Amino acid sequence: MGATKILMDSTHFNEIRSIIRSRSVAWDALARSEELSEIDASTAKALESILVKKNNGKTLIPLIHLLSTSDNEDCKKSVQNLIAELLSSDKYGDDTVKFFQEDPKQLEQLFDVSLKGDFQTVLISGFNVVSLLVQNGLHNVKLVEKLLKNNNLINILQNIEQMDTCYVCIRLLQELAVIPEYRDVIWLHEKKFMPTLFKILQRATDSQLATRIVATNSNHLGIQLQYHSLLLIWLLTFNPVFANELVQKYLSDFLDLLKLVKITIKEKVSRLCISIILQCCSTRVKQHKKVIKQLLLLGNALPTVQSLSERKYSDEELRQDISNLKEILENEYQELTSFDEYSSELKSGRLEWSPVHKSEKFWRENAVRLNEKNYELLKILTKLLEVSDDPQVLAVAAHDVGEYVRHYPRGKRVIEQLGGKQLVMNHMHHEDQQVRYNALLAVQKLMVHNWE
Amino acid sequence: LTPNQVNDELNKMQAFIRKEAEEKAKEIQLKADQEYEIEKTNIVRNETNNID
Amino acid sequence: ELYAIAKELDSWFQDVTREKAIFEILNKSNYDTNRKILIAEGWIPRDELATLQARLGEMIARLGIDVPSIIQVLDTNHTPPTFHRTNKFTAGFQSICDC
């Protein structure tokens, strides 16, 4: 009866479904020669005939017996096609949908009987089970829990070679998870598949277009997999607390979104992915600081925001979303004090690059208070540099040494009393390219501005 | 290709955009449900705390 | 650094020129947010429609979205353009024809 159909977009398995619809198995022999109940096939013929010129759902009760008494490796195909087809249109039957949500005995064991042997029968049986689960009043968590804990599905979901079965198996899961009731439940053993999904994403970003690897996969014939995967993430991330841990568990995969947003062009991924990160960075969750700074460090998406903001988009959603991303991306750290953080980083003995390190617009009044200790801390830093060999450490200090004159004019005398000019000359010929390049920059600006 | 097929590239893409927007809206409704959840829980908490 | 840049600056020059020119020429069409399609018109030779379709076979090959035909000839009231072909041996002859 009236319901919501499932699995519309997929096309390859529609013909597999039709394979048996156009055929007709021999039911008479099954019960004629000591293999089936003598009435099962008799009424089965009547039911098949009812499929045309008629339109009244109590006679479907005994099929539970047939499937329970089902013994042939493929005879179940006719009945599972019946299940998948009675839902094809509201015109079928008069008392179908109401009875499912009434008695749990048959429905619960429908899952128990199926999910064995052939791949395709397992697939279609799961499709029927989930489709029945779609309707209201069907929220029995035990079915989905037993479904999750079984390895029968993963026995085929790992087939990286074929993308069709893995497609459909992952696809049905989004419709299953539409409601939050099962997102948490799956979260228990969810780990079995997201490594696979991240592998799929890695392959997607690894898309080598110089060789034919998209054979019959384009033209909406395989692009659906990512369109539904990103939807799966945007679904499971509707909860802040559960969204927290994964970001604190896997790093490279999440960073891969910056590469993802570059290669393809199809809209089906842009708005989907951007929303996931937007959810990830909201203060609505009670953790929005642990990973943002490292995202800035290894991300450097600052060029990307303008690039995608300027380009062409007909949708009304992502335009403001990217602006939100940019404003929350730059303001969080680029708009921060430095001297306190500068001291914190230097005393730790750890020196790296950061927006503070190179940014200059916010360095109009730092120099005056960099002289509080008569540059004691900074001269000690220079000494440790003289007793340091890390090229990054070598370059970072000289950068701010140059920033001194770039901003503060009268600090030349203290620089002179440092006595490191000869050590800068020595650094001229040190092995690393970056160190000597930056040292030449610093010494050149020092000498030229020294008259300036 | 065939001139008679020029309607298929219209209707199929019509269906594709329709389903794109349908999924967008059906998940926007889930977003509305989540907004319901949070703005119900927070308001009831704040009021019932003073009641308690 | 001059040694390194020289190998690539010349190439990049005509490269980036290609992008600016292609953007410009495509920009002569009309577009609005009304429809996902793009409103464009152009004037195409009639004895190479099959070759055009075959070449658009790549459109449906790797970047496929399954909208192959974008060609439908209507009629207007203005005179069509005139054009013809030329060859290496006739660089001078053909020039003076339309000069």
Coordinates of C-alpha atoms in Angstrom, one line a residue:
Chain A
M1 CA 0.0 0.0 0.0
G2 CA 1.0 3.6 0.3
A3 CA 4.6 4.0 1.5
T4 CA 8.0 5.5 0.5
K5 CA 9.9 3.6 -2.2
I6 CA 13.6 2.8 -1.8
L7 CA 16.6 2.3 -4.1
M8 CA 15.3 4.3 -7.0
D9 CA 18.6 5.8 -8.2
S10 CA 20.4 2.4 -8.7
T11 CA 19.9 0.9 -12.1
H12 CA 22.2 -2.1 -12.6
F13 CA 20.3 -4.2 -10.0
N14 CA 16.9 -3.2 -11.4
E15 CA 17.5 -5.5 -14.3
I16 CA 18.7 -8.2 -11.9
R17 CA 15.3 -7.8 -10.1
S18 CA 13.6 -8.0 -13.5
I19 CA 15.5 -11.3 -14.3
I20 CA 13.1 -13.4 -12.3
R21 CA 10.0 -11.1 -12.8
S22 CA 9.9 -12.0 -16.5
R23 CA 10.6 -15.7 -15.6
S24 CA 8.5 -18.2 -13.8
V25 CA 9.7 -21.0 -11.6
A26 CA 8.1 -24.5 -11.4
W27 CA 6.1 -24.4 -8.2
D28 CA 3.9 -27.4 -9.1
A29 CA 6.7 -29.9 -9.0
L30 CA 7.9 -28.6 -5.6
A31 CA 4.8 -29.8 -3.7
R32 CA 4.0 -32.5 -6.3
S33 CA 6.9 -34.8 -5.5
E34 CA 7.6 -34.6 -1.7
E35 CA 9.4 -31.2 -1.5
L36 CA 6.7 -28.7 -0.6
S37 CA 3.3 -28.5 1.1
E38 CA 0.6 -29.5 -1.4
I39 CA -1.3 -26.2 -0.8
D40 CA 1.6 -23.9 -0.9
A41 CA 2.1 -24.0 -4.7
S42 CA -1.7 -24.2 -5.3
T43 CA -2.3 -20.9 -3.6
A44 CA 1.0 -19.4 -4.9
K45 CA -0.4 -19.8 -8.4
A46 CA -3.5 -18.0 -7.4
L47 CA -1.5 -15.2 -5.8
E48 CA 0.7 -14.8 -9.0
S49 CA -2.5 -14.6 -11.0
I50 CA -3.9 -12.0 -8.6
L51 CA -1.0 -9.8 -9.8
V52 CA -3.2 -8.9 -12.8
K53 CA -6.9 -8.2 -13.4
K54 CA -7.6 -8.1 -9.6
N55 CA -7.1 -5.8 -6.6
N56 CA -7.5 -8.5 0.6
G57 CA -4.1 -9.3 2.1
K58 CA -4.8 -12.1 4.6
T59 CA -3.8 -14.8 2.0
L60 CA -0.2 -13.5 2.3
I61 CA 0.0 -15.1 5.8
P62 CA 1.1 -18.6 4.7
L63 CA 4.1 -17.4 2.8
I64 CA 5.9 -17.4 6.1
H65 CA 5.4 -21.2 6.1
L66 CA 6.8 -21.5 2.6
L67 CA 9.9 -19.5 3.3
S68 CA 10.3 -21.5 6.6
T69 CA 9.7 -24.7 4.6
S70 CA 11.8 -23.2 1.7
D71 CA 14.6 -25.7 0.9
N72 CA 15.9 -25.0 -2.7
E73 CA 18.9 -22.8 -3.1
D74 CA 17.0 -20.3 -5.3
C75 CA 13.2 -21.0 -5.0
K76 CA 13.2 -18.1 -2.5
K77 CA 13.7 -15.8 -5.4
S78 CA 10.0 -15.8 -6.5
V79 CA 8.8 -14.9 -3.0
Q80 CA 11.4 -12.2 -2.4
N81 CA 10.5 -10.7 -5.8
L82 CA 6.9 -10.8 -4.6
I83 CA 8.0 -8.9 -1.5
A84 CA 9.9 -6.3 -3.5
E85 CA 7.2 -5.9 -6.1
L86 CA 4.0 -5.6 -4.0
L87 CA 5.6 -2.3 -2.8
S88 CA 6.3 -1.2 -6.4
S89 CA 2.9 0.5 -6.6
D90 CA 0.0 1.3 -4.2
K91 CA -2.3 -0.5 -6.7
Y92 CA -1.1 -3.8 -5.3
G93 CA -3.3 -5.4 -2.6
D94 CA -5.7 -4.0 0.0
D95 CA -4.3 -5.2 3.4
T96 CA -0.5 -5.3 3.1
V97 CA 1.1 -2.5 5.0
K98 CA -1.1 -2.5 8.1
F99 CA -0.3 -6.1 9.1
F100 CA 3.5 -5.7 9.1
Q101 CA 3.4 -3.3 12.0
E102 CA 1.0 -5.5 14.0
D103 CA 2.7 -8.9 14.5
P104 CA 6.5 -8.9 15.2
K105 CA 6.8 -12.7 15.2
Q106 CA 6.9 -13.1 11.4
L107 CA 8.9 -10.0 10.7
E108 CA 11.6 -10.6 13.3
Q109 CA 12.4 -14.1 11.9
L110 CA 12.3 -12.9 8.3
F111 CA 15.8 -11.6 8.9
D112 CA 16.8 -14.8 10.7
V113 CA 15.8 -17.0 7.8
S114 CA 17.6 -14.9 5.2
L115 CA 21.1 -13.6 5.0
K116 CA 22.7 -16.9 3.9
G117 CA 24.4 -18.3 0.9
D118 CA 24.2 -16.3 -2.4
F119 CA 25.2 -12.7 -2.5
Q120 CA 22.2 -11.5 -4.6
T121 CA 19.6 -13.2 -2.4
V122 CA 21.2 -11.7 0.7
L123 CA 21.1 -8.3 -1.0
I124 CA 17.5 -8.4 -2.0
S125 CA 16.4 -9.9 1.3
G126 CA 18.1 -7.1 3.1
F127 CA 16.5 -4.6 0.8
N128 CA 13.0 -6.0 1.6
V129 CA 13.7 -6.1 5.3
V130 CA 14.9 -2.5 5.4
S131 CA 12.1 -1.3 3.1
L132 CA 9.5 -2.8 5.5
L133 CA 11.4 -1.2 8.3
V134 CA 10.9 2.2 6.6
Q135 CA 7.3 2.5 7.6
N136 CA 6.1 4.0 10.9
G137 CA 5.8 1.7 13.8
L138 CA 8.8 -0.3 12.7
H139 CA 11.7 0.6 15.0
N140 CA 12.8 -2.7 16.5
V141 CA 16.4 -2.2 17.3
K142 CA 17.3 -5.9 17.8
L143 CA 16.9 -6.6 14.1
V144 CA 19.4 -3.8 13.1
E145 CA 21.8 -4.9 16.0
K146 CA 21.9 -8.5 14.8
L147 CA 22.4 -7.2 11.2
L148 CA 25.3 -5.1 12.3
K149 CA 27.1 -7.7 14.4
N150 CA 27.1 -10.3 11.5
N151 CA 30.1 -10.6 9.2
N152 CA 28.0 -11.8 6.3
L153 CA 27.6 -8.3 4.9
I154 CA 31.3 -7.3 5.4
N155 CA 32.2 -10.5 3.5
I156 CA 31.0 -8.6 0.4
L157 CA 31.4 -5.0 1.4
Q158 CA 35.1 -5.4 1.3
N159 CA 35.0 -6.2 -2.5
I160 CA 36.9 -3.1 -3.7
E161 CA 37.0 -4.8 -7.1
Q162 CA 33.3 -4.4 -7.8
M163 CA 31.6 -1.1 -6.9
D164 CA 28.0 -2.1 -7.5
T165 CA 27.2 -4.4 -4.5
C166 CA 29.2 -2.2 -2.2
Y167 CA 27.3 0.8 -3.6
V168 CA 23.8 -0.7 -2.8
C169 CA 24.9 -2.0 0.6
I170 CA 26.1 1.3 1.7
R171 CA 23.2 3.1 0.0
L172 CA 20.5 1.3 2.0
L173 CA 22.3 2.3 5.2
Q174 CA 21.6 6.0 4.8
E175 CA 17.9 5.4 4.5
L176 CA 18.2 3.1 7.5
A177 CA 20.0 5.8 9.5
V178 CA 17.6 8.7 8.5
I179 CA 16.3 8.6 12.1
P180 CA 18.8 9.1 15.0
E181 CA 17.5 5.9 16.6
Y182 CA 20.0 3.7 14.7
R183 CA 22.9 6.1 14.3
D184 CA 24.0 5.5 17.9
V185 CA 23.3 1.8 17.6
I186 CA 25.5 1.4 14.6
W187 CA 28.2 3.6 16.2
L188 CA 29.1 0.6 18.4
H189 CA 30.6 -1.5 15.5
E190 CA 30.7 1.2 12.9
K191 CA 34.5 0.8 12.7
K192 CA 34.1 -2.2 10.3
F193 CA 33.4 0.0 7.3
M194 CA 34.5 3.6 7.6
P195 CA 38.1 2.6 7.0
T196 CA 36.8 1.2 3.8
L197 CA 34.8 4.4 3.1
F198 CA 37.9 6.5 3.7
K199 CA 39.8 4.2 1.4
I200 CA 37.1 5.0 -1.2
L201 CA 37.5 8.7 -0.6
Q202 CA 41.3 8.4 -0.9
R203 CA 40.9 6.6 -4.2
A204 CA 38.5 9.3 -5.4
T205 CA 41.0 12.1 -4.6
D206 CA 43.6 9.8 -6.2
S207 CA 41.6 9.8 -9.4
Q208 CA 44.1 9.5 -12.2
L209 CA 42.4 10.7 -15.4
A210 CA 45.4 9.9 -17.6
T211 CA 44.2 6.3 -17.7
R212 CA 40.8 4.8 -18.2
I213 CA 39.6 3.9 -14.7
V214 CA 36.0 5.3 -14.9
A215 CA 34.8 2.7 -17.4
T216 CA 30.9 3.1 -17.5
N217 CA 31.3 4.7 -14.1
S218 CA 30.5 8.3 -15.1
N219 CA 27.1 9.6 -16.4
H220 CA 25.4 9.0 -13.1
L221 CA 26.7 5.4 -13.2
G222 CA 28.9 5.4 -10.1
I223 CA 29.2 9.0 -9.1
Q224 CA 26.3 8.2 -6.7
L225 CA 28.6 6.4 -4.3
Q226 CA 30.3 9.6 -3.0
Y227 CA 27.1 11.6 -3.2
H228 CA 25.6 9.1 -0.7
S229 CA 28.7 8.6 1.4
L230 CA 29.0 12.3 2.1
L231 CA 25.3 12.2 3.0
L232 CA 26.0 9.4 5.4
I233 CA 28.6 11.5 7.2
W234 CA 26.4 14.6 7.2
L235 CA 23.7 12.3 8.7
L236 CA 25.8 10.7 11.5
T237 CA 27.3 14.1 12.3
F238 CA 23.9 15.5 13.3
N239 CA 25.0 14.8 16.9
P240 CA 27.8 17.0 18.3
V241 CA 29.1 14.6 21.0
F242 CA 29.4 11.7 18.7
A243 CA 30.8 13.9 15.9
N244 CA 33.6 14.9 18.3
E245 CA 35.6 11.6 18.7
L246 CA 36.2 10.8 15.0
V247 CA 37.8 14.2 14.5
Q248 CA 39.9 13.3 17.5
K249 CA 40.6 9.8 16.1
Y250 CA 41.6 10.1 12.4
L251 CA 43.5 13.1 11.1
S252 CA 44.7 12.7 7.5
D253 CA 41.3 11.5 6.2
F254 CA 39.6 14.7 7.5
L255 CA 42.3 16.9 6.0
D256 CA 41.7 15.2 2.7
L257 CA 38.5 17.2 2.2
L258 CA 40.6 20.1 1.0
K259 CA 41.9 17.9 -1.9
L260 CA 38.4 16.6 -2.4
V261 CA 36.9 20.0 -2.9
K262 CA 39.4 20.6 -5.8
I263 CA 39.4 17.7 -8.2
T264 CA 35.7 17.1 -9.1
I265 CA 33.2 19.8 -10.1
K266 CA 29.9 18.1 -9.6
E267 CA 27.7 20.0 -7.2
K268 CA 26.5 16.8 -5.5
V269 CA 29.7 16.9 -3.3
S270 CA 30.5 20.5 -2.7
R271 CA 27.5 21.6 -0.5
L272 CA 27.5 18.2 1.1
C273 CA 31.1 18.2 2.3
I274 CA 31.3 21.9 3.3
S275 CA 28.3 21.4 5.6
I276 CA 30.1 18.5 7.4
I277 CA 33.1 20.7 8.3
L278 CA 30.8 23.6 9.2
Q279 CA 29.1 21.3 11.7
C280 CA 32.5 20.1 12.8
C281 CA 33.7 23.6 13.7
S282 CA 30.6 25.0 15.4
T283 CA 30.7 26.1 19.0
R284 CA 27.4 24.2 19.4
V285 CA 29.6 21.3 20.4
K286 CA 31.7 21.6 23.6
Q287 CA 34.9 21.1 21.7
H288 CA 36.0 23.5 18.9
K289 CA 39.6 24.2 19.7
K290 CA 41.6 21.0 19.8
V291 CA 41.9 20.5 16.0
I292 CA 41.2 23.9 14.5
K293 CA 44.8 25.1 15.0
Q294 CA 46.3 22.0 13.4
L295 CA 43.8 22.4 10.6
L296 CA 45.2 25.8 10.0
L297 CA 48.8 24.4 10.3
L298 CA 48.5 21.6 7.7
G299 CA 45.5 23.0 5.9
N300 CA 46.4 26.4 4.6
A301 CA 42.9 26.7 3.0
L302 CA 43.1 30.5 3.1
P303 CA 43.7 30.7 -0.7
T304 CA 40.9 28.2 -1.3
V305 CA 38.1 30.2 0.4
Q306 CA 38.4 33.2 -2.0
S307 CA 39.0 30.9 -5.0
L308 CA 35.7 29.1 -4.5
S309 CA 33.8 32.2 -3.3
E310 CA 34.6 34.0 -6.6
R311 CA 33.7 31.1 -8.9
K312 CA 30.3 30.1 -10.3
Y313 CA 27.4 28.6 -8.4
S314 CA 23.7 28.6 -9.0
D315 CA 22.7 27.3 -5.5
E316 CA 21.6 29.6 -2.7
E317 CA 23.1 27.6 0.1
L318 CA 26.9 27.3 -0.2
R319 CA 27.4 31.0 -0.9
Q320 CA 26.8 32.1 2.7
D321 CA 28.2 28.8 4.0
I322 CA 31.7 29.5 2.6
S323 CA 31.5 33.0 4.0
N324 CA 30.8 31.5 7.4
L325 CA 33.7 29.1 6.9
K326 CA 36.1 31.9 6.1
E327 CA 35.0 34.2 8.9
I328 CA 35.3 31.3 11.5
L329 CA 38.6 30.1 9.9
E330 CA 40.5 33.4 10.0
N331 CA 39.1 35.1 13.1
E332 CA 39.7 32.1 15.4
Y333 CA 43.5 32.3 15.3
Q334 CA 44.7 35.0 12.8
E335 CA 42.9 37.4 15.1
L336 CA 44.8 36.6 18.3
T337 CA 47.5 38.2 20.5
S338 CA 51.1 37.1 19.8
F339 CA 53.6 38.1 22.6
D340 CA 52.0 35.8 25.2
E341 CA 51.8 33.0 22.6
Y342 CA 55.3 33.9 21.4
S343 CA 56.7 33.5 24.9
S344 CA 54.8 30.3 25.4
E345 CA 56.1 28.8 22.2
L346 CA 59.7 29.9 22.7
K347 CA 60.1 28.7 26.3
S348 CA 58.8 25.3 25.3
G349 CA 61.8 24.9 23.0
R350 CA 59.5 24.1 20.1
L351 CA 59.6 26.5 17.1
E352 CA 57.3 26.2 14.1
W353 CA 55.4 28.4 11.6
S354 CA 52.1 29.9 12.4
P355 CA 49.9 32.9 11.2
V356 CA 51.5 34.8 14.1
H357 CA 55.0 34.0 12.8
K358 CA 54.6 35.7 9.4
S359 CA 51.7 38.1 9.9
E360 CA 52.7 41.7 10.2
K361 CA 49.6 43.9 10.2
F362 CA 49.1 43.1 13.9
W363 CA 52.8 43.9 14.7
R364 CA 52.6 47.7 15.1
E365 CA 53.0 47.8 18.9
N366 CA 54.5 44.5 19.8
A367 CA 58.2 45.6 19.5
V368 CA 57.9 48.2 22.3
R369 CA 56.9 45.5 24.8
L370 CA 59.4 43.1 23.3
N371 CA 62.0 45.4 25.0
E372 CA 60.6 44.9 28.5
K373 CA 63.4 42.5 29.5
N374 CA 65.9 44.4 27.4
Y375 CA 65.3 41.7 24.8
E376 CA 66.7 39.2 27.4
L377 CA 64.4 36.4 26.2
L378 CA 65.0 37.1 22.5
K379 CA 68.8 37.4 22.9
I380 CA 68.7 34.1 24.8
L381 CA 66.7 32.7 21.9
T382 CA 69.5 33.9 19.6
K383 CA 72.0 32.1 21.8
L384 CA 70.1 28.8 21.7
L385 CA 70.0 29.4 17.9
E386 CA 73.8 29.6 18.0
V387 CA 73.6 26.3 19.8
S388 CA 70.8 24.9 17.5
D389 CA 70.9 23.0 14.3
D390 CA 67.2 22.7 13.3
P391 CA 66.8 24.6 10.0
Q392 CA 63.2 25.7 10.9
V393 CA 64.5 27.0 14.2
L394 CA 67.3 28.8 12.4
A395 CA 64.9 30.5 9.9
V396 CA 62.1 31.4 12.3
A397 CA 64.3 33.5 14.6
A398 CA 66.0 35.4 11.8
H399 CA 62.5 36.1 10.4
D400 CA 61.6 38.1 13.5
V401 CA 65.1 39.6 13.7
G402 CA 64.3 41.1 10.3
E403 CA 60.8 42.1 11.5
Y404 CA 62.6 44.2 14.1
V405 CA 63.9 46.7 11.6
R406 CA 60.9 46.2 9.4
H407 CA 58.8 47.6 12.2
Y408 CA 61.1 49.1 14.9
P409 CA 63.8 51.5 13.6
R410 CA 65.8 52.3 16.7
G411 CA 66.5 48.7 17.7
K412 CA 69.6 48.6 15.5
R413 CA 72.0 49.4 18.3
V414 CA 70.9 46.3 20.4
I415 CA 71.2 44.2 17.2
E416 CA 74.8 45.5 16.9
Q417 CA 75.6 44.7 20.5
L418 CA 74.3 41.1 19.8
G419 CA 77.4 40.4 17.8
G420 CA 75.7 37.7 15.7
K421 CA 76.6 39.4 12.4
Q422 CA 79.6 37.2 12.0
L423 CA 77.4 34.2 12.8
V424 CA 75.0 35.4 10.1
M425 CA 77.9 35.5 7.7
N426 CA 78.7 31.9 8.7
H427 CA 75.1 30.9 8.2
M428 CA 75.4 32.2 4.6
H429 CA 77.0 29.0 3.5
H430 CA 75.2 26.4 5.7
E431 CA 74.0 23.4 3.8
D432 CA 70.2 24.0 3.8
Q433 CA 68.9 26.2 1.1
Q434 CA 66.2 27.8 3.3
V435 CA 68.5 28.7 6.1
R436 CA 71.0 30.6 3.9
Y437 CA 68.2 32.2 1.8
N438 CA 66.5 33.6 4.9
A439 CA 69.8 34.6 6.4
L440 CA 70.7 36.5 3.2
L441 CA 67.3 38.2 3.4
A442 CA 67.8 39.2 7.0
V443 CA 71.4 40.5 6.6
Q444 CA 70.5 42.3 3.4
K445 CA 67.6 44.1 4.9
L446 CA 69.6 44.8 8.0
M447 CA 72.5 46.4 6.1
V448 CA 70.3 48.4 3.7
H449 CA 67.9 49.6 6.4
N450 CA 70.8 50.3 8.7
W451 CA 71.3 53.5 6.6
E452 CA 67.6 53.8 6.1
Chain B
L1 CA 22.2 11.7 -31.1
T2 CA 18.8 10.8 -32.5
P3 CA 16.6 14.0 -32.7
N4 CA 13.7 12.2 -30.9
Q5 CA 16.0 11.7 -27.8
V6 CA 16.4 15.4 -27.1
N7 CA 13.4 15.1 -24.7
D8 CA 15.1 12.4 -22.6
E9 CA 18.1 14.7 -21.7
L10 CA 15.5 17.1 -20.5
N11 CA 13.2 14.8 -18.5
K12 CA 16.0 12.7 -17.0
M13 CA 17.9 15.7 -15.8
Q14 CA 14.6 17.2 -14.5
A15 CA 14.3 14.0 -12.4
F16 CA 17.9 14.2 -11.3
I17 CA 17.6 17.8 -10.0
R18 CA 14.2 16.9 -8.5
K19 CA 15.7 14.1 -6.5
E20 CA 18.7 16.2 -5.5
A21 CA 16.4 18.9 -4.1
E22 CA 14.1 16.2 -2.6
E23 CA 17.0 14.7 -0.6
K24 CA 18.1 18.2 0.4
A25 CA 14.7 19.0 1.7
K26 CA 14.1 15.6 3.4
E27 CA 17.4 16.2 5.3
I28 CA 16.4 19.8 6.0
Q29 CA 13.4 18.4 7.7
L30 CA 15.7 16.2 9.8
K31 CA 17.6 19.4 10.6
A32 CA 14.2 20.9 11.7
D33 CA 13.7 18.0 13.9
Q34 CA 17.1 18.5 15.5
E35 CA 16.3 22.2 16.0
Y36 CA 13.0 21.1 17.7
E37 CA 15.0 18.8 19.9
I38 CA 17.5 21.3 21.1
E39 CA 15.1 24.3 21.5
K40 CA 12.7 22.0 23.4
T41 CA 15.2 20.5 25.8
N42 CA 17.0 23.8 26.6
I43 CA 13.8 25.7 27.3
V44 CA 12.2 23.0 29.4
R45 CA 15.5 22.6 31.3
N46 CA 15.7 26.3 32.0
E47 CA 12.1 26.7 33.2
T48 CA 11.9 23.4 35.1
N49 CA 15.1 24.3 37.0
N50 CA 13.4 27.3 38.5
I51 CA 10.3 25.3 39.2
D52 CA 12.5 22.8 41.1
Chain C
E1 CA 66.4 31.3 -9.8
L2 CA 66.4 32.9 -13.3
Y3 CA 67.7 29.6 -14.8
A4 CA 64.8 27.7 -13.3
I5 CA 62.1 30.2 -14.1
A6 CA 63.1 30.6 -17.7
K7 CA 62.2 27.0 -18.5
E8 CA 58.5 27.7 -17.5
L9 CA 57.7 31.4 -17.7
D10 CA 57.5 31.4 -21.5
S11 CA 55.2 28.4 -21.6
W12 CA 53.0 29.7 -18.8
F13 CA 52.6 33.0 -20.8
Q14 CA 50.7 31.5 -23.7
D15 CA 49.1 29.0 -21.3
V16 CA 47.4 31.7 -19.1
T17 CA 46.6 33.5 -22.3
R18 CA 44.6 30.5 -23.4
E19 CA 42.6 30.5 -20.2
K20 CA 41.8 34.2 -20.4
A21 CA 40.8 34.0 -24.0
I22 CA 38.6 30.9 -23.5
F23 CA 36.9 32.5 -20.5
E24 CA 36.3 35.6 -22.6
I25 CA 34.9 33.8 -25.6
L26 CA 32.6 31.6 -23.4
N27 CA 31.5 34.7 -21.5
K28 CA 29.6 36.0 -24.6
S29 CA 26.7 33.7 -23.8
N30 CA 23.7 34.6 -21.5
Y31 CA 23.3 33.0 -18.1
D32 CA 20.9 33.4 -15.2
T33 CA 20.4 31.5 -11.9
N34 CA 16.9 30.6 -13.2
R35 CA 18.1 27.3 -14.8
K36 CA 21.0 25.0 -14.3
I37 CA 21.5 25.0 -18.1
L38 CA 23.4 27.8 -19.8
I39 CA 21.7 30.0 -22.4
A40 CA 24.0 30.1 -25.4
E41 CA 23.8 30.4 -29.2
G42 CA 26.4 30.1 -31.9
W43 CA 26.8 29.5 -35.6
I44 CA 28.0 26.1 -36.7
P45 CA 28.9 24.4 -40.1
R46 CA 26.3 21.8 -41.2
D47 CA 28.5 19.2 -42.9
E48 CA 30.3 18.2 -39.7
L49 CA 27.5 17.4 -37.3
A50 CA 28.6 13.8 -37.1
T51 CA 32.2 14.8 -36.3
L52 CA 30.9 17.2 -33.7
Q53 CA 28.9 14.4 -32.1
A54 CA 31.8 12.0 -32.1
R55 CA 34.1 14.7 -30.6
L56 CA 31.5 15.3 -27.9
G57 CA 31.8 11.5 -27.3
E58 CA 34.5 12.6 -24.9
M59 CA 32.0 14.8 -23.2
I60 CA 30.0 11.6 -22.4
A61 CA 33.2 9.6 -22.0
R62 CA 35.0 10.8 -18.9
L63 CA 33.0 13.9 -17.7
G64 CA 29.8 12.2 -18.6
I65 CA 26.5 13.7 -17.4
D66 CA 24.2 12.2 -20.1
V67 CA 23.0 15.2 -22.0
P68 CA 24.8 14.6 -25.4
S69 CA 22.9 16.6 -28.0
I70 CA 23.0 20.4 -27.6
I71 CA 22.3 21.0 -31.3
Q72 CA 18.8 21.9 -32.6
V73 CA 18.6 24.0 -35.7
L74 CA 16.0 26.7 -35.9
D75 CA 15.4 29.4 -38.5
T76 CA 16.1 33.2 -38.5
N77 CA 15.5 36.1 -40.9
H78 CA 19.0 37.4 -41.2
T79 CA 21.6 36.4 -43.8
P80 CA 24.0 33.6 -42.6
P81 CA 27.7 34.1 -42.6
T82 CA 29.9 33.1 -45.5
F83 CA 33.1 31.0 -45.0
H84 CA 35.2 28.4 -46.8
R85 CA 38.4 26.4 -46.4
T86 CA 42.1 27.1 -47.1
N87 CA 45.3 25.1 -47.6
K88 CA 49.1 25.5 -47.2
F89 CA 49.7 25.7 -50.9
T90 CA 47.1 28.5 -51.2
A91 CA 48.2 30.8 -48.4
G92 CA 48.3 33.8 -50.8
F93 CA 45.6 32.9 -53.3
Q94 CA 42.8 32.5 -50.7
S95 CA 43.8 35.6 -48.8
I96 CA 43.3 38.0 -51.8
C97 CA 39.9 36.3 -52.5
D98 CA 38.3 38.0 -49.4
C99 CA 40.8 40.8 -49.0

